[PDB]
């Protein structure tokens, strides 16, 4: 019976791993590059529009970094849950 817990424990640890999915940084770099490519073909190098787009991209980057920060707090929480759950066994 106590050895069932350990089997359940790893399933919690396995599911806890999936919970902090993150992986946004790789996709974000492709998106910003796609906008930069469009910006280049549009001839941004009109001037006022180009400045606003870049300002939006930096806020989007902040949003992505913000989303990544909460994902780390999730990972901190899944660790603390594993800690107290281990205390009984």
């Amino acid at each position: 019976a106590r050895e069932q817990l350990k089997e359940g424990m790893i399933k919690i640890e396995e599911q806890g791993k999936k919970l902090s999915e993150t992986r946004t940084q790789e996709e974000l770099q492709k998106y910003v590059a796609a906008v930069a490519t469009f910006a280049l073909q549009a001839g941004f190098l009109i001037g006022k529009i180009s400045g606003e787009v870049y300002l939006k991209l930096l806020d989007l980057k902040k949003a992505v970094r913000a989303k990544e920060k909460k994902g780390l707090d999730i990972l901190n929480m899944v660790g603390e849950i594993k800690g107290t759950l281990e205390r009984v066994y």
Binding site: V32, A33, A36, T37, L40, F44, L45, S50, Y54, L55
Partner: protein, 119 residues
């Protein structure tokens, strides 16, 4: 040299937080320098060169240090690497390497007489 915190969004978090004005281009405020350097944002975000953002900012927002009261330009190698990466892409979109960004004007790395920033 009067140091002022860098407010240009493109030049934040580049390795130093303080700059002085006017820059080599005779811009009197960061708002004036910011408006020009921000036009280069597609080349920075496309990442043609890892060294482009530092090189551009090191001129439009030159580094200011409380102990070293002297302009500290980027090493020529920084300029050359940024040109190697981004000049072909610029050329593909009809833009030549800007005359103000000529690398020959910058001091070479490792010279005992003049110091420069290289990373």
């Amino acid at each position: 040299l009067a140091c002022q915190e860098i407010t240009v969004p493109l030049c934040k978090g580049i390795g130093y937080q303080y700059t002085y004005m006017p820059n080599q281009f005779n811009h009197d405020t960061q708002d004036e320098a910011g408006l020009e350097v921000h036009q280069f944002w597609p080349l920075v975000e496309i990442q043609c060169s890892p060294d482009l953002k530092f090189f551009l900012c090191s001129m439009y927002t030159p580094i200011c240090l409380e102990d070293y009261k002297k302009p500290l330009p980027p090493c020529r190698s920084v300029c050359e690497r940024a040109k190697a990466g981004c000049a072909p892409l610029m050329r593909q979109y009809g833009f030549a390497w800007p005359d103000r960004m000529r690398c020959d004007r910058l001091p070479e790395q490792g010279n005992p007489d003049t110091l420069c920033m290289d990373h």
